[PDB]
Paper text:
After optimizing initial conditions, SC16 crystallized as a cluster of plates over 1–2 weeks. Virtually indistinguishable atomic-resolution structures were determined for two crystals of SC16 that existed in two different space groups: C2221 and P21212. An α-helix was present in L1 from 50Lys-59Leu. Residues near the N-terminus and L2 (C2221: 79Val-85Asn, P21212: 78Ser-85Asn) did not have interpretable electron density, consistent with these regions being flexible. EPPIC detected a large intermolecular interface that was present in both SC16 crystals and had a surface area of 607 Å2 and 589 Å2 for the C2221 and P21212 space groups, respectively. This surface involves both the N- and C-termini of SC16 interacting with L1, L2, and the β-barrel of a second symmetry-related SC16 molecule, with 44Thr, 72Leu, 89Ala, and 110Ile being flagged by EPPIC as participating in close contacts. In particular, the N-terminal tail adopts an extended structure from 27Gly-32Ser with partial β-strand character that associates with the β1 strand over residues 42Asn-46Asp of a symmetry related SC16 molecule. Although the buried surface area (~ 600 Å2) is smaller than the 800 Å2 expected for a definitive biological contact, it is larger than a typical crystal contact, involves a very small protein, and is found in two different space groups. Repeating units of this interface also result in a linear association of SC16 monomers that suggests a possible assembly pattern within rodlets. We found that although the N-terminal tail of SC16 associates with neighbouring molecules in the crystalline state, it is dynamic in solution and does not significantly influence the self-assembly rate or morphology of SC16 rodlets.
Author numbering: 11 to 62, 71 to 99
């Protein structure tokens, strides 16, 4: 068996995360641009995310858009000791 963490998807390293209930206007605007419905989102929104070393936020996300411009359905994950 290989090591496993996220139930769905790779671990992501996201430069920034925000609570999907308290997104700033630029983040909100960017998600509308991408046609993402805010009211159907849960947990965190990640910005500028790369699948996995991470000096920013390591998160599990259900979806990633535009090469990691925006992730959604993100929750923190600890893959250390």
């Amino acid at each position: 068996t290989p090591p496993k963490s996220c139930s769905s998807g790779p671990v992501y390293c996201c430069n920034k995360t925000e609570d999907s209930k308290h997104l700033d206007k630029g983040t909100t605007a960017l998600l509308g641009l991408l046609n993402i419905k805010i009211g159907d989102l849960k947990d965190l929104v990640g910005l500028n995310c790369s699948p996995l070393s991470c000096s920013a936020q390591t998160v599990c996300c259900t979806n990633t858009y535009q090469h990691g411009l925006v992730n959604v359905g993100c929750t923190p994950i600890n893959i250390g000791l």
